[PDB]
Ligand code: HEM
């Protein structure tokens with residue numbers, strides 16, 4: 139009753155062009171079985187959303203990668219928030235919610251905005267730049283590590299560690315094994331920076347430690363919570379901004395609309411997040427036998443959610459393949475949905491908004507003028523290189 143498919147959603151051919159296979163996954167039925175990895179798959183918006191919002195049945199404490207923590211050892215001590223279910227998840231969620239709070243955004247907005255403006259003006263003096271290295275990557279590295287309160291030494295491990303984290307959610311394919319093997323230097327750097335003495339007062343990391351005084355988290359929990367902010371946030375945001383610039387270069391009509399009303403910057407980034415969904419997939423594990431789309435799924439089964447496919451499901455979105463900076467994006471699952479919905483979403487939108495605002499006000503055209511190269515990762519979608527010529531307004 140459940141269609142079996144041989145599609146490998148973690149293969150390079152799939153990464154290279156996922157969208158046709160995603161329609162195959164969507165149209166085969168509301169629930170499919172992927173024989174290549176022995177997991178269930180849900181690629182329609184309705185089922186992905188239902189699964190995200192049913193945490194008692196589709197749990198997170200057995201890992202959000204392919205690996206089942208009841209069966210294998212996690213490659214690193216499990217995240218206190220991402221890999222936890224309620225009630226264990228609740229208090230670490232509240233701490234991160236407050237550290238990255240709306241109130242917190244007021245303290246960093248002016249510096250984040252200034253850095254984005256300065257970066258666009260800088261790139262306009264060069265003309266022909268790589269919108270990944272020189273923009274999508276450079277901008278977040280120039281604001282976030284400082285906002286964390288990270289010291290200067292060792293920041294070179296930040297991008298390798300982020301890519302490792304997301305590759306590790308995948309199956310035990312080449313990408314994951316190459317990532318995990320010899321990863322200890324990245325792990326050692328990150329773990330060391332999680333200790334209180336290494337975090338500048340006033341920053342996100344130090345503020346997490348400050349919450350150990352309140353009883354929401356204990357001192358031995360703080361380093362693992364700090365680790366969360368050195369795991370998530372960087373690569374996704376980089377890929378998100380990179381996708382936006384690519385979209386603004388492939389849809390010149392939308393760059394012109396954004397130029398005419400820079401206040402669309404925030405929604406132009408949200409639409410970028412739906413359109414490319416930097417986080418393409420992750421897993422839940424059934425805690426009990428469950429019915430989903432007429433399919434009975436046993437207990438202890440891994441379930442693969444296709445966030446990107448759900449964000450392009452024509453059952454939910456009109457013209458899902460088009461970049462529309464005035465689309466009503468409310469409801470997209472690019473940040474997840476429910477109890478685990480991205481706690482860092484306010485930082486990501488700030489970074490994305492102020493960068494697109496900088497572009498909206500200072501750039502007149504964005505033209506691809508060189509080979510575009512995709513960045514490959516088990517869970518993340520994004521570009522490796524995007525050579526563009528920027529025309530000043
Ligand atoms: C475009 C950028 C981003 C995207 C697409 C994204 C995506 C996601 C998704 C899909 C989830 C849900 C995971 C799940 O349900 O299992 C999530 C949660 C999370 N995100 Fe983000 N994220 C982004 C930016 C950030 C930033 C900037 C931070 C930190 C500053 C961050 C930190 C986290 C954390 C700690 C969680 C775990 C939340 C929980 O388990 O309650 N992310 N993110």
Ligand SMILES: O=C(O)c1ccc(OC(F)(F)F)cc1
Pocket residue numbers: 217218219220221303365366367369370371417420
């Ligand atoms: O707590 C962590 O280490 C963590 C890691 C990754 C992450 O991003 C996503 F996988 F998309 F949810 C969120 C949190």
Ligand SMILES: [Cl-]
Pocket residue numbers: 214324325326328329365
């Ligand atoms: Cl680590």
